[PDB]
Design a protein around this ligand. Structure first.
Ligand SMILES: [Ca+2]
Length: 508
């Protein structure tokens, strides 16, 4: 029967789902300590499923409102909610914070039976670290000769509405339709799953210090929903609007939200376009249609910074105000401006897309034997393919990058060498030499204090470095550009100072 069973130690919640879903919540800790799906225990027996590494102690209550049951767990600065609807095999959740947890990240982890749920979806075993030996920190491993990490399960949040773990008789999915309280914008990615050897972990990292570019946001995180299937795969269309009737701290219902709608224009139409709104309270985003039209998700009222990207490259920024129950009409327009191009390596998309090892890097470590050589490599304009240009340069692996190009007599005037990047590590930034002319040494970028290129990530502050080349420095015939990564810091191999490339363009 749909309902709550009360004992001194626990509430047992029965969803009355057709294929059976019951779970046990500790009244002392709020840990989920048992999950029974289709007659089978799925919860790891030695450690609970919970926020963080457990709330430890919480004040727990459970109540039924019609066809809904709500479990509430209160701690000093965090309240955790679990909500179920009669007939649905889903644990809906939301997490209300008034301070960031002491660990400096906010996550939910389901620790589930890895014999029953060995697989990770959609990326497969690249985040399976079971039987692995650590090669970096305690989070990148060698399993046989293949590099593995929880991080290689990651996906851009704008594209991460569903991720799962599964076996041949059960599947468990996170369905994530509300990232408004997360940090780092639409292109932030984070750990999604990890079969680590004792259990298979399924996560939602609401926020973290993993290549974090923004401050944390307080308030209600989610809703998020954990769906239990036999062999089906659930749709991401899951109504959670019933949260409006359950006195959920921080919950702002549809009626309390407005929207922004309009058309973006001017950017590179061969790229996907994204519009992004943010302020200290909330962040939102949407893809535009091919015509540039967009409508934001339902937004909390307030004033927001509004950004228009082609790929992940920002072409315009504006400001807009939203009020409840109304649509603010707001267009946005811009384009990437350079000049008359002598050569261009890559595209202005805020990514290392097309470069050597870029596709591999999302799903394996740079030391993996399956990576192509990092270099030093010499890219000759007009002969080399883009996959011969390294996606990143590391002070102590493949420094420097050399570019050879031919110029005509009509191209020997003044020019600008533009070195666009995505993400730095340990102070890495470029210093360029063009023939016998040496550009100034830029200052160190802002330190994000996080590994990234070794953990399947590339979305940083997108620093761009221009070098002014005087007329008569380019010569008719062959020319040589050397890009060195400079930094006062040091490191072993891929932890040496480094940056990931976006695009290198020489224009007049
Ligand atoms: Ca690029």
């Amino acid at each position: 029967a749909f309902g709550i069973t009360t004992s001194s130690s626990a509430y047992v919640i029965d969803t009355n789902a057709p294929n059976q879903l019951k779970f046990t919540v500790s009244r002392s800790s709020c840990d989920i300590t048992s999950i029974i799906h289709y007659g089978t225990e799925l919860q790891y027996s030695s450690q609970g499923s919970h926020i963080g590494s457990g709330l430890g102690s919480a004040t727990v209550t459970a109540t039924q409102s019609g066809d809904y049951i709500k479990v509430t767990c209160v701690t000093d600065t965090l309240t955790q909610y679990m909500v179920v609807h009669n007939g649905d095999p889903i644990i809906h959740m939301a997490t209300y914070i008034t301070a960031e947890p002491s660990i400096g990240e906010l996550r939910f982890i389901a620790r589930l039976n890895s014999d029953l749920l060995p697989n990770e979806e959609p990326f497969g075993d690249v985040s399976t670290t079971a039987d692995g030996t650590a090669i970096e920190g305690s989070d990148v491993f060698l399993v046989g000769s293949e590099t593995r990490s929880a991080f290689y399960s990651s996906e851009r949040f704008i594209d991460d509405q569903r991720h799962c773990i599964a076996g041949d008789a059960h599947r468990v999915c996170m369905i994530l339709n509300q990232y408004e309280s997360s940090s780092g914008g639409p292109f932030h990615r984070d750990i999604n799953s990890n079969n680590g050897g004792s259990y298979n972990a399924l996560y939602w990292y609401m926020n973290s210090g993993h290549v974090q570019t923004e401050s944390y946001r307080m308030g209600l995180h989610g809703p998020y929903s954990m769906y239990f299937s036999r062999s089906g795969t659930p749709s991401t269309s899951i109504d959670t609007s019933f949260f409006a009737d359950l006195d959920i701290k921080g919950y702002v219902a549809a009626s309390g939200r407005g929207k922004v709608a309009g058309t973006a224009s001017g950017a590179d139409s061969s790229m996907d376009w994204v519009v992004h709104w943010y302020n200290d309270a909330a962040q939102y985003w949407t893809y535009t249609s091919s015509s540039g039209s967009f409508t934001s998700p339902a937004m909390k009222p307030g004033t927001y910074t509004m950004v228009y990207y082609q790929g992940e490259y920002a072409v315009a920024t504006s400001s807009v105000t939203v009020s409840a129950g109304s649509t603010t009409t707001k267009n946005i327009s811009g384009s990437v401006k350079t000049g008359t191009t002598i050569f261009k390596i890559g595209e202005w998309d805020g990514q290392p897309t097309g470069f050597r090892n870029a596709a591999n890097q999302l799903r394996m470590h740079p030391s993996d034997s399956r990576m192509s050589s990092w270099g030093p490599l010499t890219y000759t304009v007009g002969s080399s393919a883009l996959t011969d240009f390294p996606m990143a340069v590391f002070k102590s692996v493949n420094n420097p990058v050399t570019i050879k190009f031919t110029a005509t007599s009509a191209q020997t005037g003044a020019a600008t060498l533009r070195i666009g990047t995505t993400l730095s590590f340990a102070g890495g930034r470029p210093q360029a030499t063009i023939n016998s002319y040496t550009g100034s040494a830029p200052a160190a970028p802002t330190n994000l204090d996080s590994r990234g290129v070794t953990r399947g990530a590339y979305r940083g502050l997108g620093e761009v470095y221009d070098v002014s080349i005087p007329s008569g420095t380019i010569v008719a015939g062959t020319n040589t550009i050397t890009i060195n990564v400079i930094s006062g810091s040091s490191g072993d191999t891929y932890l040496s100072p480094n940056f990931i490339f976006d695009c290198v363009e020489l224009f007049q």
